[PDB]
């Protein structure tokens, strides 16, 4: 008695794995060496981004199975292979328990290039949308009730760093702790800050001697809020201990970052030392030239640094912490090195959906 | 109560609204599906204009389906196909007043091509090949 009727243009989306473009806001005239790539793959942005807001939808966000961090991992490798060209690279090949590996020596020209990050967007073609979770107390996975449809995001500044989150996105209400599975002891716990921890970090007029001042009281109250938040998930009676590191490579046993093309390796031994129960710190940085690569397995040595004082002030906005599960108190040492987790903290609240505007429903029509 | 007229909720809006309310505003969504307007070596349109062509092609692909289940007076038409019980056997008071389109297609996504092939073949070979016999006299 009831007949099927077709409908074109119903608000229905599915989970896709499409490829987005960037569309950042470059100037196409400078030689900042981000803006060369930031014009090379990016069209200029729009002046009026749309912020259409939905009413009753509840959508399941996921963080650690997101298909945007691999798109991050492709184009940031493409950007770092053009912007900062090192002098000599050593990449093993190991052509085929019976195997031997040989290393090559690729040598290219290495001029001194300026390096300062530029905030970029990631925008989708027609037929797609990005759902965005507006909850100020988002756990990280599962349902979000205040889902808003977005053309494309805010500016993400691609700062390669370890042991911390530098120039990130600040939290709304409180300090958030995001983890796929607590009491698993094998996954990096990402922690966002609700306030920016300002730090000066400079090399003044031995060229490989840089000192790095961070305020004591602001860091103390920030980690007061942090250890307040870790007691939520651990029974409200455990002692919290912050160690420095546990061996490893120089880019993971120390806070490794970049500043004007200079490759900073600052020690954080006196920065994570307190034990918690129920004026300025200086960091002994050492500027190096023979570094390890995160894009692939290998070595890279670079030109000697330029002459003069170098300045870069920055805002500390997060943490990569890792538990030391034993057999009582809890030990939390800083870690990192996985860059997919480095840009998962700023792409945690986004999801790419594909629209399918063709539905069918039973109604009572004929001819 | 008093009124001033309807409103504009935006593109992809009212996805959490009811079925009969979201079926009222298909025109605004279908107009945005095509979008349009827009208005050194420096050739980035090799990417960008590419995307534009893709969008146009996508519309034609959907148009092809809506051209071949032949109504072409779009956003609403009807066919002569009765439903089958394996495709979410629900009644009208379940299906038209109390859920959105997301929860409908979330369960009809299992049965996409099995109804699309039947709507492809049945009326389009049965409403055809009979008016030629009716044109004999």
């Amino acid at each position: 008695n009831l007949w099927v009727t077709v409908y074109y243009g119903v608000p229905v989306w599915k989970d896709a794995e499409t490829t987005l473009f960037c569309a950042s806001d470059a100037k196409a005239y400078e030689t900042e060496k981000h803006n060369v790539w930031a014009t090379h793959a990016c069209v200029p942005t729009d002046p009026n981004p749309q912020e259409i807001h939905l009413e009753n939808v509840t959508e399941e966000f996921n963080m650690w199975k997101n298909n945007m961090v691999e798109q991050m991992h492709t184009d940031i490798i493409s950007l770092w292979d053009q912007s900062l060209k090192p002098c000599v690279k050593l990449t093993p090949l190991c052509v085929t328990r019976l195997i031997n590996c040989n290393t090559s020596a690729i040598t290219q020209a290495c001029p001194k290039v300026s390096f300062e990050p530029i905030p970029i967007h990631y925008c989708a073609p027609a037929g797609f949308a990005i759902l965005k979770c507006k909850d100020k107390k988002f756990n990280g996975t599962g349902p979000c009730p205040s889902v808003s449809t977005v053309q494309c995001t805010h500016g993400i500044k691609p700062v390669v760093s370890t042991q911390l989150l530098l120039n990130g996105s600040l939290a709304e209400e409180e300090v958030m702790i995001r983890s796929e599975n607590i009491t698993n002891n094998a996954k990096n716990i990402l922690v966002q800050f609700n306030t920016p921890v300002q730090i000066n970090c400079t090399r003044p007029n031995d060229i490989r001697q840089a000192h790095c001042n961070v305020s004591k009281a602001t860091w103390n109250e920030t980690l007061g809020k942090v250890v307040k938040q870790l007691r939520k998930h651990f029974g409200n009676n455990t002692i919290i201990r912050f160690a420095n590191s546990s061996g490893g490579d120089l880019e993971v046993t120390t806070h490794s970052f970049n500043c004007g093309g200079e490759f900073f390796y600052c020690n954080t031994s006196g920065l994570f030392n307190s034990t918690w129960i129920s004026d300025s710190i200086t960091l002994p940085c050492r500027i190096k030239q023979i570094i390890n690569m995160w894009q692939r397995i290998g070595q890279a040595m670079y030109a000697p640094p330029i002459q003069g004082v170098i300045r870069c002030v920055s805002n500390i906005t997060g943490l990569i912490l890792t538990r030391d599960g034993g057999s009582t108190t809890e030990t939390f040492r800083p870690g990192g090195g996985d860059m997919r987790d480095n840009w998962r903290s700023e792409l945690y609240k986004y999801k790419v959906v594909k629209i399918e505007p063709l539905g069918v429903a039973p109604t009572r029509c004929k001819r | 109560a008093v009124g001033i007229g309807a409103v504009f909720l935006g593109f992809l809006g009212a996805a959490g609204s009811t079925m009969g309310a979201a079926s009222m505003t298909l025109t605004v969504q279908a107009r945005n599906l095509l979008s349009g307007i827009v208005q050194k070596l420096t050739v980035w349109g090799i990417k960008q204009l590419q995307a534009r062509v893709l969008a146009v092609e996508r519309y034609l692909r959907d148009q092809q389906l809506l051209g071949i289940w032949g109504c072409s007076g779009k956003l609403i038409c009807c066919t002569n196909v009765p439903w089958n019980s394996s495709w979410s056997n629900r009644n009208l008071s379940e299906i038209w007043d109390n859920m959105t389109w997301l929860q409908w297609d979330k369960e009809i996504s299992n049965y996409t091509q099995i109804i699309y092939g039947l709507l492809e073949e049945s009326q389009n070979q049965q409403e055809k090949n009979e008016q030629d016999l009716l044109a004999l006299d």
């Epitope: 807001h53 | 008093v2 001033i4 007229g5 504009f8 935006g10």
Partner: antibody, heavy 119, light 105 residues
């Protein structure tokens, strides 16, 4: 998250005009109608008018017909209220309120701003 | 116009009491009245739309009944944050008028 932000307090002489702006955050401005309501100090609530932000259509009370004018701007999501020919009776707090607007008719005013004091 | 009379004008009660406040409309308004709460110095916030339905975020201790011209707001148990000024306002016809207001203490 859903919030209306008004402008600061303004003091004017009688016979002048006063303009107050109300900006929306947290929701789509073109989908909900907007009311204006005034409270005299020590008195009750007096309704003023209500506007569609989409079509620009207005509806004004007949007591203040031709004296208060209501406009909109969709580019910055702001509505403007113009009250002309002021007397001492018009001093009070001006509030912009988002209509809940179910079934394309007036239902209730759920999201209210912080207020503007006009003397 | 349509005039709304609220009774009583000033009510006195203790913490934990059940109270009922009556809004009377001069004309037939069906069920198109809404109930609001205002603290002094702050904006009014909505409790009841459609004269019987609870607004999301309002606690369940409040209720509202009525039809025609006779309308009641009922608080089952008074809390110290509930001591404020209550209003009724309609939308059946132009112009919109608010009630006189009921201050509870």
């Amino acid at each position: 998250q859903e919030v209306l932000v008004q402008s600061g307090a303004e003091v004017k002489k009688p016979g002048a005009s006063v303009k107050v702006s109300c900006r929306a955050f947290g929701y789509t401005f073109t989908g909900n109608a907007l009311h204006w309501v005034r409270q005299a100090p020590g008195q009750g609530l007096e309704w003023l008018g209500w506007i569609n932000p989409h079509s620009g259509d207005t509806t004004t009370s007949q007591k203040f017909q031709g004296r208060v004018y209501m406009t909109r701007d969709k580019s910055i999501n702001t509505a403007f209220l113009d009250v002309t020919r002021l007397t001492s009776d018009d001093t009070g707090i001006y509030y912009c309120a988002r209509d809940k607007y179910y079934g394309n008719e007036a239902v209730g005013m759920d999201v209210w701003g912080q207020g503007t004091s006009v003397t | 116009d349509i005039q709304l009379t609220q009774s009583p004008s000033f009510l006195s009660a203790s913490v934990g009491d059940k109270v009922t406040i009556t809004c009377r409309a001069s004309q037939g308004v069906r069920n198109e009245l809404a109930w609001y709460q205002q603290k002094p110095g702050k904006a009014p916030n909505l409790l009841i739309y459609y004269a019987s339905t609870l607004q999301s975020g309002v606690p369940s201790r409040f209720s509202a009944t009525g039809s025609g011209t006779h309308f009641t707001l009922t608080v089952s148990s008074l809390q110290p944050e509930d001591f404020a000024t209550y209003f009724c306002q309609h939308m059946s016809s132009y112009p919109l008028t608010f009630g006189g207001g009921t201050k509870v203490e």
